[PDB]
Design a binder for this molecule. Structure first.
Ligand SMILES: Cc1cc2nc3c(=O)[nH]c(=O)nc-3n(C[C@H](O)[C@H](O)[C@H](O)COP(=O)(O)OP(=O)(O)OC[C@H]3O[C@@H](n4cnc5c(N)ncnc54)[C@H](O)[C@@H]3O)c2cc1C
Ligand SMILES: Cc1cc2nc3c(=O)[nH]c(=O)nc-3n(C[C@H](O)[C@H](O)[C@H](O)COP(=O)(O)OP(=O)(O)OC[C@H]3O[C@@H](n4cnc5c(N)ncnc54)[C@H](O)[C@@H]3O)c2cc1C
Ligand SMILES: [Zn+2]
Ligand SMILES: [Zn+2]
Lengths: 466, 467
């Protein structure tokens, strides 16, 4: 809310940065407009310096200078984050990983990838798929998001159900600390219990404890067969039974289970001009499978589909194994958040709730907000108990905010849920962590922040309580 | 040797305080303290004069509060199956046992989330969840004695790591008592939760130097409908490696375990445990487990895999089982190797992560470097994860053999950019060889974490950071 007492960038600081990062000092005000605005376009900083280092040493030297000079630094990746973590609040120096985009090594047998933090996720997927491997995560933001940002936010995504957390799949990190110290935890071993797993501190730390410069990550083998079933369900009870039956009948080949409601389908059709491939339904389910024997997978899907259609769990369904149609079906899900931001002002909640009551809050909000909301939608990673809850309005209303908050957070706390399942904390959620974390946890978090960055130059105003 | 730090000593008043805090949970009899003072390998013995066995987290908090005010060192202990001396005192540290913290708090039969006290025995948790059609995400030969809290504190790997991955992924939450007795509630029984720093990760693999784990929330995989085991003899390590490659290519996602052992391992398990080999005599053996939803499909995958492996000469003889009894018999040949080794004599033990293509090199090397001074040299373990268990047995310890083994093995491993402790951890034994796997700045940051969380150093002194 109020700017902390950091120094201001002088002409000598600019000349120092030009010495440290020749060619990577952007000060043109019109060029700084895009990096000062967050993805949702509801936060806008006033930073006058963007730095674009090429190497880890340049990052170390930048932070050394900023530490001696007490200048605040805002690390930025693809700038697709949803919680205002990725843009300055005031005049923080924006340190971009855009030019830190080289792959350093890839072991064609172990599947271990070592790459710079600014490698774009989509580009890494292409790279490892050319070598019959895949990234352990994928996101709708794949085209822009940086692997460094994925690690910093502990991104979940669309294959989390199968491959799990970056806490498991990240094998090593090189991190530059606030004073410039380079911390080498960049091991490439599957198993290494030689002391504390320090890298874990930086996974989900959202740039407040250090700048991730190099990532080593375990890539799963590329599946021989990927199938997608897009199904229409006549209610949420049937969605939940489709999930239970899916786990019973598909089992280890399951790689994704996503859901969306009718209003989501209507919004992607309206704003993105994507047609539905199945009959109109109150709910849609996207199931992905990934396996090594295409025939066994096809048989599993056949028997699953036959039972689900036969027992009335699914009303209408389409299947795809062709890469093009698979991408078509996936686009209906991946681009929901975009269609929502085109419907007007978006109130965005990212909740972990018991799966059996994942949609209850959507119905509650629809009753609580009558004609004062444009739309209330629920979609997301049902398999992981993760609901994306969005409310759209024709314009922002402080009235509608008072109706939504704290109510939504209180409901989540009443379910012992998470008020930020995936997207993290950043600027937006720094003062609502008490609904998911007790004061002693938040206190230890503050102690770690003070140990690793005593001057608080890395990402001020985030991601700890005020 | 190592010098005792200036901690206080246990007085009669401390014994009365502990008797207040945990009624009936204070053991002072010297003959009773014998067993908890000796490590699993029986080569380290502490001189602790008090064992505390609390039942509840509040009791652990109050115990540690008292020890913090009094400057009394504390040695947390679970199943006491640890391999690196972390589990027993060096001098007179108070032994804090989780043996009586053995309750299951809750289990959700849909999400598969287990919440239980740290002292629940792994095998007993397995029986509990399997009755409900789930399994534990980890398994190990110590299952009969090790505590889930010990597994989290050591970041235990084990026999199904290849399928379900690290505890860093499968642990959903922890309740931890800090050195001053503060109860840290990170007990988040949620699949996903990005509300600040993932503090629990610090305590996974911290071996009781940053806090005492009292409650665990863990994700339990569903119980597989079909489990198969194949046990195969391979004529050389190259064929072992191609059997692994082929196994991944043909079994794929249903693979749940890949373990190897050498001929000497088989001989020792046969000689000491009287377990006959079910395949023709071979220089290497491989145990493969699969876990899947469809028996027919898994059987087809295994049949084709076996066809191709036997066809191209990667495997000389093989046997398969689905009957639970026979599956367990085959698993016993691998699980009980460590016991047979400790029955063979004094054991020099190394637990290394190496490039899989070079996993067995050190064994051949040491067989040549050592002579008749080694009774046996063996290599076995989690080949799918790049993890070698290297062991040398002899009739008795000798300084000469130790000098031939060390630092040579650790320098070899560093030469391969490997880990000198893949899964067993550091503890007392390996505290001064971390430089072979970790750079100075990381070790310093670890020391700063220790100073922040335990500035008095009462939790597991003389471990698991450098001196
Ligand atoms: C269409 C769309 C779909 C999405 N889908 C998902 C999804 O399925 N799951 C999910 O979890 N999220 C999802 N997200 C949001 C997600 O948080 C980001 O897309 C992703 O994590 C990558 O963020 P980024 O690379 O853009 O990092 P940025 O947005 O640039 O930064 C995010 C935060 O991390 C910090 N940071 C960035 N780079 C570094 C670095 N190198 N070192 C240290 N700190 C750094 C920033 O300071 C900021 O606090 C989606 C976003 C969009 C727009
Ligand atoms: C036959 C056999 C097979 C094994 N197989 C494997 C294997 O496959 N993979 C593997 O990784 N290891 C294996 N191990 C060793 C492994 O480290 C232990 O089996 C187990 O992980 C530790 O559990 P425990 O309760 O015995 O811990 P202990 O030995 O009692 O203690 C382990 C360490 O953690 C600390 N600690 C214990 N409980 C707590 C707690 N509640 N809170 C904080 N700190 C605590 C102790 O102070 C000590 O430093 C095996 C051991 C044996 C004997
Ligand atoms: Zn998401
Ligand atoms: Zn092992």
């Amino acid at each position: 809310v109020r700017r902390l007492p950091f120094s201001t960038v002088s002409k000598q600081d600019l000349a120092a940065f030009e010495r440290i990062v020749p060619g990577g000092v952007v000060t043109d005000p019109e060029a700084l407009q895009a990096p000062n605005v967050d993805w949702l376009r509801t936060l806008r900083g006033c930073s006058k310096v963007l730095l674009r280092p090429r190497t880890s040493e340049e990052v170390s030297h930048i932070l050394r200078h900023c530490h001696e000079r007490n200048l605040a630094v805002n690390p930025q990746g693809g700038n697709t984050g949803m919680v205002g973590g990725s843009v300055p609040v005031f005049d923080e120096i924006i340190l971009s990983t855009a030019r830190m985009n080289r792959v350093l090594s890839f072991h064609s047998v172990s599947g271990i990838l070592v790459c710079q933090a600014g490698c774009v996720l989509e580009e890494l997927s292409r790279y490892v798929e050319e070598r019959d491997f895949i990234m352990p995560l994928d996101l709708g933001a794949k085209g822009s998001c940086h692997i460094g940002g994925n690690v910093a936010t502990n991104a979940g995504g669309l294959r989390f159900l199968r491959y799990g957390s970056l806490h498991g799949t990240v094998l090593g990190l090189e991190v530059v600390l606030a004073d410039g110290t380079v911390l080498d935890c960049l091991t490439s071993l599957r198993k290494d219990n030689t002391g504390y797993d320090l890298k874990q501190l930086f996974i989900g730390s959202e740039g407040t404890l250090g700048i991730i410069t190099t990532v080593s990550i375990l890539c799963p083998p590329k599946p021989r067969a990927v199938n997608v079933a897009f199904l229409g369900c006549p209610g949420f009870a049937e969605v939940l039974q489709t999930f239970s039956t899916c786990k019973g009948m598909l089992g280890e080949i399951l790689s994704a289970f996503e859901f969306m409601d009718a209003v989501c389908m209507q919004l992607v059709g309206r704003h993105l001009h994507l047609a539905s491939p199945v009959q109109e339904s109150p709910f849609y389910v996207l199931i992905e499978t990934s396996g090594s024997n295409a025939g066994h997978d096809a048989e599993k899907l056949g028997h699953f589909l036959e039972h689900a259609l036969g027992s009335g769990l699914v009303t209408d369904g389409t299947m795809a194994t062709d890469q093009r149609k698979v991408k078509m079906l996936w686009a209906l899900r991946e681009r929901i958040t975009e269609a929502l931001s085109r419907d007007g002002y978006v109130y965005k909640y990212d909740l972990s709730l018991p799966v059996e009551r994942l949609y209850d809050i959507v119905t509650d909000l629809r009753a609580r907000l009558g004609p004062h909301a444009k739309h209330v939608v629920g979609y997301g990673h049902l398999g992981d108990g993760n609901l994306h809850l969005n409310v759209t309005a024709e314009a922002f209303s402080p009235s509608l905010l008072a109706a939504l908050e704290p109510h939504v957070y209180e409901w989540t706390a009443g379910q012992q849920g998470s008020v930020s399942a995936e997207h993290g904390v950043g600027f937006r959620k720094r003062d609502v962590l008490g609904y998911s974390k007790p004061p002693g946890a938040l206190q230890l978090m503050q102690q770690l922040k003070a140990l690793l960055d005593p001057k608080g130059i890395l990402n001020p105003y985030k991601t700890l309580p005020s």
